[PDB]
Design a binder for this molecule. Structure first.
Ligand SMILES: CCc1ccsc1-c1ccc(O)c(O)c1
Ligand SMILES: [Mn+2]
Ligand SMILES: [Mn+2]
Length: 261
């Protein structure tokens, strides 16, 4: 629950490595590349260069090192050597690294080639829904307020939030308490405290919120075939706000968010 300064430092390291996988893979995300190849590149980098390990491989039996979800695929897309990226594709790459016992959990959207109207819009709105949630994190606030704020913002755009999946406490365990819902729920009642580490990872559907799992047991798609986007950051709650542990160079939000004067 409450991380020690030394545990937080390990989180900073693990968080940076996860972020750097996403920075590293960027130039490869182009038309013609396979999702299977992107997965190999990520894994080779995590293992051989970061001297770390993917938390995703073998987790609940997951066959790959990273999750790669395209378009109407909501989450848990399986990297496949035959799956080639096309122009106009929106693509999420979700990475979780373990280094020195601690987890770093992050994802971003890439748009392949020329962005379509919906693609640009959904990805922009999804990141912003994460950003506004990030700006709310500080001691004393309830997670319900944060969930409600994401949902309100997303829905005001005419989009929907996926219910089945949520952010989560993170540390030595991939998934720890608390659950971080991206919508208002009567069972959410968690007051944020300094030292808490968790993820915020809104999945946003252009259309309806309902999802469907494929016959592979893994691939989750929107039920109405609409586009779906996701961004994720791992954070630590500080005394006066939060620090984003998985911040990248392409992030347009500061690493340290303070509400003190
Ligand atoms: C793909 C690994 C996996 C299996 C069941 S849930 C899950 C997963 C994937 C990405 C995440 O960010 C996460 O918190 C969990
Ligand atoms: Mn993730
Ligand atoms: Mn996660």
């Amino acid at each position: 629950s409450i991380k020690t300064p030394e545990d937080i430092e390990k989180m900073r390291v693990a968080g940076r490595l996860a972020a750097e996988v996403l920075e590293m893979i960027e130039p490869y995300v182009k038309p013609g590349v396979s999702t299977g190849e992107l997965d190999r590149i990520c894994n080779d980098y995590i293992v051989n260069e970061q001297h770390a390990v993917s938390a995703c491989l073998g987790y609940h039996g997951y066959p790959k090192s990273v999750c790669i979800s395209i378009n109407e695929v909501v989450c848990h897309g399986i990297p496949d050597d035959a799956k080639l990226l096309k122009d106009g594709d929106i693509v999420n790459i979700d990475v979780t690294v373990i280094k020195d016992g601690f987890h770093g959990d992050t994802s971003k959207m890439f748009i392949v080639g020329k962005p379509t109207i919906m693609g640009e819009r959904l990805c922009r709105i999804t990141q912003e829904s994460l950003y506004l949630a990030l700006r709310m994190v500080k001691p004393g606030i309830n997670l319900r307020e944060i969930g409600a704020a994401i949902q309100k913002f997303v829905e005001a755009e005419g989009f929907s939030v996926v219910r089945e999946y949520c952010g989560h406490g993170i540390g030595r365990g991939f998934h720890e308490e608390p659950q971080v819902l991206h919508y208002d729920s009567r069972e959410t009642n968690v007051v944020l405290k300094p030292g808490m580490t968790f993820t915020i990872e809104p999945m946003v559907n252009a259309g309806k919120k309902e999802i469907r799992t494929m016959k592979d047991g893994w691939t989750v798609k929107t039920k109405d075939r609409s586009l779906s986007a996701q961004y994720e950051h791992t954070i630590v709650v500080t005394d006066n706000g939060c620090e984003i542990l998985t911040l990248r160079k392409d992030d347009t939000i500061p690493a340290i968010i303070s509400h003190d004067e």
